Write a protein that binds this ligand. Structure first.
Ligand SMILES: Nc1ncnc2c1ncn2[C@@H]1O[C@H](COP(=O)(O)OP(=O)(O)NP(=O)(O)O)[C@@H](O)[C@H]1O
Ligand SMILES: Nc1ncnc2c1ncn2[C@@H]1O[C@H](COP(=O)(O)OP(=O)(O)NP(=O)(O)O)[C@@H](O)[C@H]1O
Ligand SMILES: [Mn+2]
Ligand SMILES: [Mn+2]
Ligand SMILES: [Mn+2]
Ligand SMILES: [Zn+2]
Ligand SMILES: [Zn+2]
Ligand SMILES: [Zn+2]
Lengths: 159, 286, 771, 278, 284
RNA sequence: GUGGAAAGGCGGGCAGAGGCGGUUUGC
RNA sequence: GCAAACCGCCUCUGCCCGC
C-alpha cells in the first residue's frame, strides 16, 4: 500500500500527509533508487519533484530538525549568492559544504542517526559529481532539488 | 504589382495606426522643413501626375498584414460552401468581423477563395493613466490617455507606388526626418518615433474593372461597396473640418479620388490627401 | 368599414378556443366562438360583435359548404346597419379563412403550451404581468377546466370595458392568451395570441393588396407575390450611444438608449399609419431591428421608398453619419409562408431578405447625393459630450456648468434624463407643437409625466398593458423596456461616483455586457410566421421584463445558489443602461455586477429549457474613465468569450501564457464548481474571511506571485514546491490541497493546471475584502 | 525653420529603488510593459519632473532674469490659487483641473520665457510646441538578459504606520524596482532658432542636475528616487544630414562623464564644433 | 502659494551600528526566521529611508507634544492642538495633537497647506490633506553598507548572525525558542539626508529641529526590539554642504562646505551651531 | 503642410509592540 | 562510565486619504 501510493510523478501529495513499517522499506528502496540516481544532471523533468516528495517523506517520519540543516541550507544560500555574478568556482566551498556535512552527522547524537543516515546517503553521491563540475549547470538542478527537499519537509509536518 | 514597403520600426508607443491623410500631412511638413515651400508644391504636383502612398498597416515579424476587402461579405455564403453547417455559421461570423489578413490570405480574398484570419494582432490599445501636479501643493489631477503599444518584433508599415526619383528625393528624406520627430500624438513624450527600412513587396492582384482602396480615398463618383470614415484633424493649430473619407478595403471603379485644398486662414493652402491606392479585385453579382 | 372589420375579423375568430377548453356550450369551437361574441353583443356591447361572430363561425371549413349555408345566416344578420354590402361582408370571410392557413401551415384534448425552446417541456398558464411568476417550462400537466373557466371570466371582464378597435384588443389578448396553445396537439409551440396577432396581419394585408373572394376560392392569392416582408435594422448603435466623453454621469447615457428606441418607433409606426396597417402587422420590434408583413401594391412600394428617403436624410443631418437605418423588402407569396415538401420556404425568404440588409449596410449613405461632395462651411466647433461637429452659434450653455457650450440635442437629453423616474411613456405628435423635448425623423415626442393629461394621436406607454388615462380617440402603443436603476437619496438615477461607493471591498466600477449566442440559427428553425412571432417575443421578454424581476431578488428555488460575496440586498445599486433584443448592458457596483452575471445566466438556463445559453463579458474600471472606453473594452471581452467554446463568461482581466493552450474566459459550469469548493474555506460571508485566516492575507496576496511564475512558462515546475512551503509553516495544510502537486492526467489531456483556474476565485475574494 | 536635432543619449542608473505607480499580488504595482511585464520610466514622468524642477528654479529668479529673458516681467513669484483666476499677475497662471502650472498663453510670450520655450506652451490661438522629446527609458540589454535568467527586477517592500501612543502597526506593500537597474534614456532637442540654443541646453542640463539631488517618482522622501545620469554620446544631426543621408553629423564624446562635468567643465570644450556650424 | 528654491543642504555621514541592528521583512525556503531586509541585487542588508524618516518624525512629534506651551509662541497652528490623541473619539480633526487615523493609528499630520507652513513638525516632514497638501523638505535615502564592508563580505566575514531568544513561560518554566537574524555589531552603513531650502527666513530652526531628532535617536533605538538590545545607532558626520542655486547652473564646486568629520551629533546642535554655519548665512 | 498643442500617478505613513537558550529528572 | 527528555514560533495589524 506504501509503494502503490508512491507512483511515478505525483500520486498523492495530501494522501501521504494523512499517512511506520509500510514505507520503512518502500520509501527506503526508493531512497536507494534515489541513491541509484547518481547523475544529478539526468532529470530536468518532474522526476526531481517526484523524487523530493519521496525523499522528504522518508525523513519527515524521522526527526530531521531543520535548524541543524540550516548550516547546510545557508551554505547553499551564500554560494547561490556567489552564482549571481560573484564567483565562478564553488570547488573551495563544496568541500567546505562536505566538511560541515560530516560535522552535521558528527554532531547530531541520540535518536537522529537514521534521519541523518539518509541525509548523508542522498546528497553526497550527487556532490561527488559536483566536485569536478561547472557551477552554473548541474548545481541549479541540485539546488532546485535542494529547495524541494525542505519545501516538502514543512508540508508533511516538520520543523 | 511591385511596391516599396516602407517599414516603421517603433521606438515607443504610437497614438493610433496612421492613415494616408496624416502621412501626407507629415511628409509635407517634413519637406517644408528640410527643403522649403518651393518643394511642397512640387510634391503635391507629383502625386497628381504620378503615383501615391497607402495607409499604414501593422506587421509582425515578416508577416505583413493588409486590410480585409469589403468584396467578401456578400460573397461569404459562396466562399465557405465546403464547410459543415455546425461550424459554417461561426466561421463566417468571425470572418465578416475581421479587420486584417495575412499577405497570402489577402491574395486569396482578392480572388474570392477560402482564407483564414490571424490569431495575434501585433498591438494593444492600453490606457496609461497620467497626472497633473501642482507646483506648490503637489495636488494630483488624473486624466486618461490611450496608446498603441506594439510587441517585440512588430511595428507598422505603408506602401508606395510610383516613379523612383519622386521617392528618392521627397519620401525617402521625409521618413528620416519623421523618425526623429513624431507621427501624430504626444510626440514630446517620445511617442511617434521609429526607425525606417525600405523593402520590396509583391502582391498578386487579379485584373478586373473593379479595385480595392488601400488608403483613405475621398471618392468623386459613388463607390461600389464602402465603409465611411468621418475624420478631420488639425493644421498648425487651426482645425480642419470633418470630411467623409472611405476606409481602406472599400471598392471603387475607375476612380482616382482627388487631393482637396483648404484655406483655414493660414499663409499657405492646406491640402488634404484624397488619393486612392488601387489593387484589382473580383466581385460577386453586386 | 371593411378595413377595421377584416383586422378585427382574424384577430377575433380563433377566440372560442378558450371557451371550448372551459366547456360553456356544446363543442366544435366555431359554434361556441359564435355564441361567445353574440353573447357579448347583448350585455354592454354594440351590434358589431353581432357581425364579428361570423368570422369565428365560418372557419375550419365545417360550415362553408355549397356556398349557400353562409348566405342564409348573413342575410338576416344585416350589414346595412353599418355601411357594408352583401358582397363586401361575404368577401372578408374568405380573406380571414385563407389567412388562417397562411399563418399555421397545418385533437379534442386539454394540453398546455409547450416551450418554443424545448418542445418536450410545457408552460403552466400564467398572466403576462411580469410580477412574481417566471414561467419555467417544467413537467407537462394537463391544464384543468377550472383554470380555463377562470381564463374566460377575466377575459369577459376585459372585453366589455375595452373599445372595439384593433389597438385596444391586442393588449387584452396579450395579457391573458399568451400562454394558451393554438392547436391542442403534441408539442405544439405556437401561442394563441401570436396565432391571432399574425392572422389579423395577413388578413389586412390581403385586403390592402386587393384580392377578393374569387382570388381565394381559386387559389390565385397563393403562388402569386401579393405579400411583402419589410425588415429594417439600425447600424451604428454601439458608436451612437456609448461614444461620449467624461460628461453626463449615467443620466444622459441612460437617456441615449431611451431616445434611440423612440427613433425606432417613429419609423415603425410611420409605416403602419401610412400603408393602412395595424400594430399586428409588426412581427417583432426587438433591439433596433424590426419586421413587418405588408401588402404588395405599387402604391406601397412607392411610399416605402419615400419613408426610407426621409428617414435616412433626417439621420444624416442630425447624427453626422453615426447611425444608419437600412430598410429592405422582398416580395413573397402565400406558399412562401409555409413549409413545402421538406424544404423550408419561410427561412429561405428570410435569408434572401437578410442578404439585402447585408449589401445595404455596405453602402452606408448612398441615398444622400451630397455625401462625398465637400462644402465650405465656416466657424464650426464640437460638443464636449458626444463630439459632433456643429456650426457654433447653434451651441448653447448647459444646465450643469454654464461655461460648457453643448449642442442642443444634448440639453434635451439631460432634461429627459432627469425625468426618467417621473415618466409613464411618451406622446407622439407633430414636430411643431409645444412641450416637445426630442424630435424623431417624422414626429416629435412629448413627455407624458406621472400626473397630467397626454397629448398626441399615438400615445406610447411603457411597461404596462393598460390604457389608464388615455383619451378614447388616441392610439395605444404598449412597449416594454428594462428600467431598473438605483436611486440616490433624491429621486433621480444614481451616479458612476455613487454606485461604486457602496461596493463591499475596493472601489471599482462593474460593467457587464452579454448576449444570447447562436440565436440566428434558432430563428431559422421557424417555418411559419406565427412560430417566428412566438419565438421572438419570449426571448424579447426575458431582457425587457424578466431582468428587473431578477434584480428585485425573486426566483429563489429556480436560481438556487450562486457565487455571491454579500447576500442579495433589497436595494441593489445596479443601473440597467439597456436590455433588449438578445443583449444587455448593465453597470453598477462591481460586487453585485459579479453576482448578477451568474444570476441572470442561471435564470436564462431555466427560462429556455437548457437549449440556449448566454455569454457574458466583464470588466472592472475606474470611475473617471469615460464610458466610450469602458464599453470598447468589455465589447472586446464579450467577443473574447464568444470566439471560444461559446458558453463562457469572462470574469476578470487575467494574464495567461502565450502558448495558445490557455483561455481567458471561464466556462459557466467550470467556474461555478470552483466556487463551491474554494469559497467556504477562505470566505465566510459579508466581506470577511474565515477563522484561522484573519489578517493572514500575506499568504493569499503572495500566492498570486507563485501563480505568476506559472504564467511566464508552464514548462517550469517551481510553483509546485513553493506552494507547499508557504502553506506549510502557517499550518494550512488542509486549505487548498490540490494546488501543491502537479496533475499528471492534465498534461495527458493537454489541459491547464488547477493553479491556472484558481485565479478568478482568489482575486474576486481578495478585492472584496477591503483591499 | 529647421537647423538640426541635438541628440542626447546615455543611461539612467537607479542607485536606489524606483516607483512609478499605475493604480491597477502587491497592493501598489509599478507600471509595466503590457506584453512582457518589464517596467519602464515614461517620457511624461521624466519630462514633467524636469519641468517641475525648472519652473521652481525660474520662480526663484524671476527678478534676476529680467534682461536675458523678456515675458518674465509679466509675472510675480507665487501661485494663482488664492485669487482664483487663470492668467493673473502671479507665475503659476494656468489651472488644468486642480493644480496651477506655469504655461504662457501666447506665441510671442512663450518665445521669450525660458520655461515655455523649451517645454512648450498651450495658449489660446497660440499653440507653441515644445523642442525637446523625452523617450521612454526601457531596460538595457544587460538587464533583460538578467530578466530572462530568472532574476527579479521589482521587489516588494512592506512599510507600516505606527501610532505614537499605543504603537498599533498598520502595514502596506509597495512594489518598486530593484536598486541598480540600468535604463537607456534619450532626449532630442530641436534647433529651430540658431541664436538661443546654448540657453536651452544649459537649462536642460540644469534640470538634470536638480533631478540628481531630487527624486524621480514614487515616495521619494522615503528614498524611492536617486536617479543618476550616465551619458554615452551627443550628436548634432545637421540639416545637411537629413537631405542626403550621408553620415557627417557632429559627435561629442562623453563615455563616462557626469551631469556636472558636462555643463560647464566641457560645454565650450565639447560643443566647439557644434557652435562652428551654427 | 509661493514655493521657492535656494539650495539643498546635504547631510552625509555614516550610520554606525554599535549594537546589533535589525530591520525586518516578511518571508526563500531554508533560512532564519524573522529575516532582516536585504537588497535583492547584492544580497546585503540595508536601512530604508522609511525606517529612518518616520523614526526621526516619531521621536520629534512626541517632543513637540511635550512642549505645546513653548513652541506655540514661535510657531502658529499649535493653538489648534491640545496634547493627547484622538483614540477615544473617532473623528479625524479635533483639538488633540495626533489628528489622523492612518488605518488604526494616530499620527500628527496637519490637514492643510497654510496650517502646515507654521507647524514645526509638518513644515519639515511634510503633510497630506484634502484640497491642500504640503510636501516635505527633507528626503531620506536608503542606507547601504559602506565600501569597507563590501570587502569584509567578499573576504568571508559574517555580515549578520543568528541570535536565538526564548520566551519563558512564567509558571511552568517552559522554553519557547525562536531565531532572529541581526546585522552584526560594528557594521557601518551610510545615511543621506537632504534638506531642501525653500524659505531663507526659517532654516536655522529646521536644521536644529532635524538635529534635535537625531540627538534623540542616538539616545533611543532604531528598528527591531530596541528595548531588548537591538538598537544603539550612532551618527558619524562627514560633510555638511549647501549646494546653492548657482551650483546647479554652473557646475563648478561653488558649494559651501562645513567640516565636522570627527564630531558628535550633540556637538553640532551645541552652542557653536551659529559658528559652523556662518558662511551659509552669508549666502541665504 | 500630422485628431494637433500644453499635463510627474502624485502628497503624508518606523515592520513595530511583548519574550533570560532555557528548565526536568537520570540512563 | 556520561548525557537525553522537550522547544523551535506564539498574538496582534495589513492601504488609507485626496483629484
Ligand atoms: N437603444 C439601444 N441601446 C443599446 N443597445 C441597443 C439599443 N437598441 C438595440 N441595441 C443593441 O445593440 C446591438 C448592436 O447593434 P449594431 O450596432 O447594429 O451591431 P451590429 O448589428 O452587429 N453591426 P451591423 O451588422 O452593421 O448592424 C444590437 O444587436 C441590439 O441588440
Ligand atoms: N428578440 C429578437 N427577435 C428577433 N430577432 C432578434 C431578437 N433579438 C435579436 N434579434 C436579431 O437576431 C440577430 C442576432 O444576431 P447576433 O446578436 O449577432 O447573435 P447571433 O447571430 O446568434 N451570433 P451570436 O453573437 O453568437 O449571438 C440580429 O440580427 C438581431 O437583430
Ligand atoms: Mn442591427
Ligand atoms: Mn447574439
Ligand atoms: Mn446580439
Ligand atoms: Zn452633444
Ligand atoms: Zn513660460
Ligand atoms: Zn503638524
Amino acid at each position: 500500500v506504501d509503494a502503490s501510493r508512491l507512483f511515478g510523478e505525483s500520486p498523492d501529495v495530501v494522501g501521504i500527509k494523512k499517512m511506520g513499517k509500510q514505507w520503512e522499506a518502500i520509501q527506503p528502496y526508493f531512497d536507494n533508487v534515489v541513491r541509484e540516481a547518481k547523475n544529478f544532471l539526468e532529470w530536468s523533468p518532474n522526476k526531481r519533484l517526484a523524487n523530493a516528495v519521496t525523499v522528504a517523506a522518508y525523513l519527515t517520519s524521522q526527526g530531521l530538525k531543520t535548524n541543524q540543516v540550516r548550516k547546510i541550507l545557508d551554505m547553499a544560500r551564500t554560494t547561490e549568492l556567489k552564482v549571481k555574478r560573484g564567483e565562478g568556482d564553488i570547488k573551495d566551498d563544496l568541500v567546505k559544504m562536505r566538511y560541515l556535512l560530516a560535522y552535521t552527522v558528527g554532531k547530531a547524537t541520540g535518536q537522529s542517526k537514521y534521519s541523518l543516515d539518509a541525509f548523508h546517503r542522498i546528497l553526497d553521491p550527487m556532490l561527488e559529481v559536483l566536485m569536478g563540475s561547472p557551477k552554473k549547470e548541474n548545481f541549479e538542478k541540485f539546488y532546485d532539488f535542494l529547495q524541494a527537499v525542505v519545501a516538502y519537509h514543512k508540508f508533511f509536518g516538520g520543523g | 504589382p511591385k511596391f516599396i514597403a516602407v517599414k516603421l520600426i517603433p521606438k515607443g508607443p504610437f497614438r493610433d495606426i496612421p492613415r494616408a491623410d496624416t502621412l501626407f500631412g507629415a511628409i509635407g511638413n517634413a519637406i517644408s522643413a528640410i527643403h522649403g515651400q518651393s518643394a511642397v508644391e512640387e510634391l503635391v504636383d507629383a502625386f497628381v501626375g504620378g503615383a501615391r502612398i497607402s495607409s499604414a498597416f501593422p506587421y509582425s515579424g515578416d508577416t505583413y498584414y493588409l486590410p480585409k476587402p469589403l468584396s467578401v461579405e456578400p460573397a461569404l455564403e459562396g466562399i465557405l460552401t465546403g464547410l459543415d453547417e455546425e461550424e459554417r455559421y461561426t466561421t463566417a461570423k468571425r470572418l465578416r468581423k475581421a479587420k486584417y489578413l495575412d499577405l497570402k490570405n489577402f491574395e486569396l480574398a482578392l480572388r474570392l477563395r477560402p482564407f483564414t484570419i490571424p490569431e495575434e494582432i501585433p498591438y494593444a490599445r492600453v490606457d496609461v493613466p497620467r497626472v497633473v501636479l501642482d507646483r506648490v501643493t503637489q495636488d494630483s489631477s488624473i486624466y486618461f490617455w490611450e496608446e498603441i503599444r506594439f510587441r517585440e518584433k512588430s511595428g507598422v508599415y505603408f506602401l508606395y507606388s510610383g516613379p523612383r526619383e519622386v521617392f528618392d528625393g521627397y519620401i525617402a528624406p521625409a521618413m528620416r526626418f519623421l523618425g526623429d520627430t513624431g507621427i501624430g500624438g504626444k510626440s514630446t513624450w517620445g511617442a511617434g518615433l521609429f526607425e525606417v527600412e525600405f523593402h520590396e513587396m509583391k502582391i498578386d492582384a487579379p485584373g478586373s474593372e473593379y479595385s480595392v482602396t488601400l488608403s483613405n480615398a475621398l471618392p468623386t463618383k459613388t463607390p461600389v461597396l464602402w465603409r465611411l470614415l468621418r475624420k478631420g484633424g488639425w493644421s498648425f493649430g487651426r482645425r480642419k473640418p470633418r470630411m467623409t473619407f472611405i476606409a481602406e478595403g472599400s471598392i471603387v471603379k475607375n476612380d482616382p479620388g482627388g487631393m482637396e485644398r483648404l484655406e483655414l486662414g493660414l499663409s499657405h493652402e492646406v491640402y488634404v490627401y484624397g488619393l486612392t491606392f488601387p489593387l484589382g479585385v473580383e466581385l460577386p453579382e453586386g | 368599414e371593411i378595413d377595421e372589420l377584416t383586422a378585427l375579423g382574424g384577430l377575433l375568430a380563433n377566440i372560442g378556443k378558450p371557451v371550448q377548453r372551459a366547456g360553456l356550450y356544446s363543442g366544435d369551437h366555431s359554434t361556441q366562438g359564435a355564441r361567445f361574441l353574440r353573447d357579448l353583443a347583448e350585455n354592454t356591447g354594440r351590434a358589431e360583435y353581432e357581425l364579428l361572430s361570423l368570422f369565428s363561425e365560418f372557419h375550419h371549413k365545417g360550415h362553408m359548404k355549397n356556398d349557400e349555408l353562409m348566405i342564409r345566416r348573413i342575410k338576416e344578420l344585416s350589414p346595412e346597419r353599418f355601411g357594408l354590402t352583401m358582397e363586401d361582408v361575404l368577401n372578408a370571410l374568405w380573406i380571414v379563412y385563407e389567412a388562417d392557413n397562411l399563418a399555421s401551415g397545418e385533437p379534442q384534448a386539454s394540453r398546455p403550451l409547450y416551450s418554443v425552446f424545448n418542445p418536450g417541456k410545457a408552460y403552466p398558464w400564467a398572466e403576462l404581468d411580469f410580477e412574481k411568476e417566471l414561467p419555467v417550462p417544467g413537467d407537462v400537466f394537463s391544464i384543468r377546466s377550472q383554470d380555463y373557466r377562470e381564463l374566460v371570466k377575466r377575459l369577459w371582464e376585459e372585453l366589455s370595458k375595452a373599445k372595439l378597435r384593433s389597438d385596444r384588443l391586442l393588449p387584452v389578448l396579450e395579457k391573458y392568451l399568451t400562454f394558451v396553445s393554438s392547436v391542442t396537439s403534441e408539442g405544439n409551440i405556437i401561442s394563441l395570441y401570436d396565432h391571432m396577432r399574425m392572422t389579423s396581419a395577413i388578413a389586412l394585408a390581403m385586403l390592402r393588396a386587393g384580392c377578393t373572394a374569387e382570388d381565394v376560392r381559386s387559389g390565385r392569392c397563393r403562388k402569386e407575390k401579393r405579400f411583402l416582408l419589410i425588415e429594417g435594422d439600425f447600424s451604428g448603435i454601439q458608436d451612437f450611444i456609448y461614444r461620449v466623453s467624461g460628461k453626463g454621469t449615467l443620466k444622459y447615457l441612460r437617456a441615449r438608449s431611451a431616445y434611440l428606441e423612440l427613433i425606432g418607433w417613429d419609423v415603425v409606426l410611420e409605416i403602419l399609419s401610412r400603408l393602412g396597417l395595424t400594430r399586428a402587422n409588426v412581427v417583432f420590434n426587438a433591439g433596433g431591428h424590426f419586421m413587418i408583413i405588408a401588402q404588395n401594391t405599387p402604391d406601397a412600394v412607392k411610399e416605402l421608398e419615400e419613408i426610407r428617403a426621409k428617414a435616412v436624410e433626417w439621420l444624416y443631418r442630425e447624427f453626422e453619419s453615426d447611425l444608419y437605418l437600412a430598410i429592405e423588402w422582398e416580395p413573397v407569396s402565400g406558399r412562401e409562408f409555409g413549409r413545402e415538401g421538406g424544404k423550408n420556404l419561410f427561412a429561405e425568404a428570410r435569408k434572401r431578405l437578410k442578404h439585402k440588409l447585408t449589401v445595404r449596410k455596405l453602402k452606408r449613405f448612398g441615398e444622400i447625393k451630397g455625401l462625398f461632395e465637400h462644402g465650405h462651411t465656416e466657424r464650426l466647433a464640437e460638443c464636449p459630450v458626444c463630439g459632433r461637429e456643429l456650426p457654433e452659434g447653434k451651441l448653447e450653455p448647459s444646465a450643469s456648468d454654464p461655461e460648457t457650450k453643448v449642442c442642443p440635442t444634448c440639453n434635451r437629453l439631460v432634461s429627459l434624463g432627469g425625468n426618467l423616474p417621473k415618466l409613464l411613456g411618451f406622446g407622439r405628435t407633430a414636430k411643431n407643437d409645444a412641450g416637445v423635448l426630442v424630435e424623431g425623423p417624422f414626429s416629435g415626442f412629448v413627455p407624458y409625466l406621472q400626473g397630467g393629461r397626454p397629448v398626441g394621436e399615438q400615445i406610447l406607454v411603457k411597461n404596462t398593458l393598460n390604457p389608464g388615462e388615455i383619451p378614447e380617440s388616441a392610439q395605444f402603443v404598449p412597449y416594454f423596456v428594462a428600467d431598473y436603476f438605483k436611486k440616490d437619496p433624491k429621486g433621480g438615477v444614481a451616479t458612476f461616483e455613487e454606485l461604486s461607493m457602496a461596493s463591499t471591498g475596493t472601489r471599482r466600477l462593474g460593467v457587464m455586457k452579454g448576449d444570447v449566442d447562436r440565436l440566428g440559427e434558432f430563428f431559422s428553425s421557424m417555418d411559419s410566421p406565427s412560430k417566428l412571432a412566438t419565438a421572438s417575443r419570449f426571448m424579447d421578454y426575458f431582457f425587457k421584463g424578466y431582468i428587473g424581476a431578477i434584480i428585485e431578488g425573486k426566483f429563489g428555488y429556480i436560481i438556487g445558489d450562486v457565487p455571491s460575496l454579500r447576500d442579495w440586498p433589497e436595494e441593489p445599486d445596479i443601473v440597467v443602461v439597456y436590455a433588449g433584443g438578445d443583449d444587455f448592458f448593465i453597470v453598477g457596483a462591481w460586487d453585485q455586477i459579479f453576482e448578477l452575471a451568474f444570476r441572470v445566466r442561471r435564470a436564462f438556463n431555466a427560462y429556455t429549457g437548457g437549449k440556449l445559453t448566454l455569454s457574458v463579458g466583464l470588466g472592472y474600471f475606474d470611475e473617471r474613465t469615460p464610458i466610450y472606453r469602458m464599453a470598447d473594452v468589455v465589447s472586446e471581452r464579450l467577443d473574447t468569450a464568444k470566439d471560444e467554446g461559446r458558453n463562457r463568461v469572462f470574469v476578470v482581466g487575467r494574464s495567461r501564457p502565450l502558448d495558445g493552450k490557455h483561455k481567458l474566459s471561464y466556462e459557466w459550469n467550470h467556474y461555478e464548481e470552483l466556487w463551491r469548493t474554494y469559497a467556504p474555506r477562505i470566505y465566510a460571508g459579508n466581506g470577511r474571511l474565515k477563522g484561522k485566516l484573519e489578517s493572514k492575507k500575506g499568504l493569499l496576496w503572495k500566492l498570486l506571485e507563485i501563480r505568476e511564475l506559472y504564467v511566464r512558462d508552464p514548462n517550469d515546475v517551481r510553483w509546485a514546491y513553493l506552494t507547499a512551503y508557504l502553506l506549510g509553516r502557517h499550518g494550512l495544510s488542509d486549505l487548498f490541497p490540490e494546488l501543491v502537486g502537479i496533475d499528471t492526467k492534465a498534461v495527458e489531456r493537454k489541459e491547464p493546471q488547477p493553479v491556472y483556474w484558481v485565479d478568478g476565485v482568489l482575486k474576486i475574494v481578495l478585492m472584496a475584502v477591503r483591499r | 525653420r529647421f537647423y538640426g536635432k541635438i541628440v542626447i543619449k546615455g543611461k539612467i542608473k537607479a542607485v536606489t529603488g524606483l516607483h512609478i505607480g499605475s493604480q491597477r499580488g502587491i497592493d501598489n504595482p509599478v507600471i509595466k510593459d503590457p506584453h512582457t511585464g518589464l517596467p519602464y520610466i515614461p517620457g511624461s514622468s521624466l519630462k514633467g519632473r524636469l519641468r517641475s524642477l525648472f519652473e521652481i528654479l525660474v520662480n526663484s529668479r524671476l527678478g534676476e532674469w529680467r534682461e536675458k529673458y523678456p515675458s518674465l516681467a509679466n509675472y510675480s513669484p507665487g501661485s494663482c490659487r488664492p485669487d482664483n483666476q487663470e492668467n493673473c499677475g502671479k507665475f503659476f497662471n494656468r489651472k488644468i483641473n486642480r493644480g496651477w502650472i506655469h504655461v504662457c498663453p501666447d506665441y510671442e510670450t512663450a518665445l521669450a520665457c525660458p520655461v515655455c520655450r523649451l517645454f512648450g506652451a498651450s495658449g489660446k490661438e497660440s499653440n507653441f510646441p515644445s523642442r525637446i522629446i523625452v523617450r521612454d527609458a526601457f531596460l538595457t540589454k544587460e538587464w533583460e538578459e538578467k530578466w530572462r535568467a530568472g532574476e527579479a527586477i521589482t521587489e516588494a517592500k512592506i512599510e507600516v504606520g505606527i501610532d505614537r501612543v499605543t504603537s498599533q502597526a498598520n502595514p502596506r506593500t509597495n512594489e518598486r524596482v530593484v536598486a541598480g537597474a540600468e535604463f537607456e534614456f534619450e532626449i532630442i532637442y530641436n534647433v529651430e532658432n540658431t541664436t538661443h540654443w546654448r540657453d536651452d541646453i544649459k537649462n536642460l542640463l540644469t534640470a538634470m542636475a536638480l533631478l540628481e539631488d531630487s527624486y524621480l517618482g514614487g515616495s521619494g522622501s522615503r528614498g524611492y528616487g536617486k536617479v543618476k545620469f550616465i551619458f554615452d554620446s551627443f550628436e548634432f544631426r545637421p540639416l545637411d544630414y537629413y537631405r542626403t543621408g550621408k553620415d557627417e553629423d557632429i559627435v561629442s564624446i562623453d563615455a563616462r562623464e557626469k551631469s556636472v562635468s558636462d555643463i560647464l567643465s566641457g560645454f565650450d570644450s565639447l560643443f566647439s564644433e557644434v557652435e562652428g556650424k551654427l
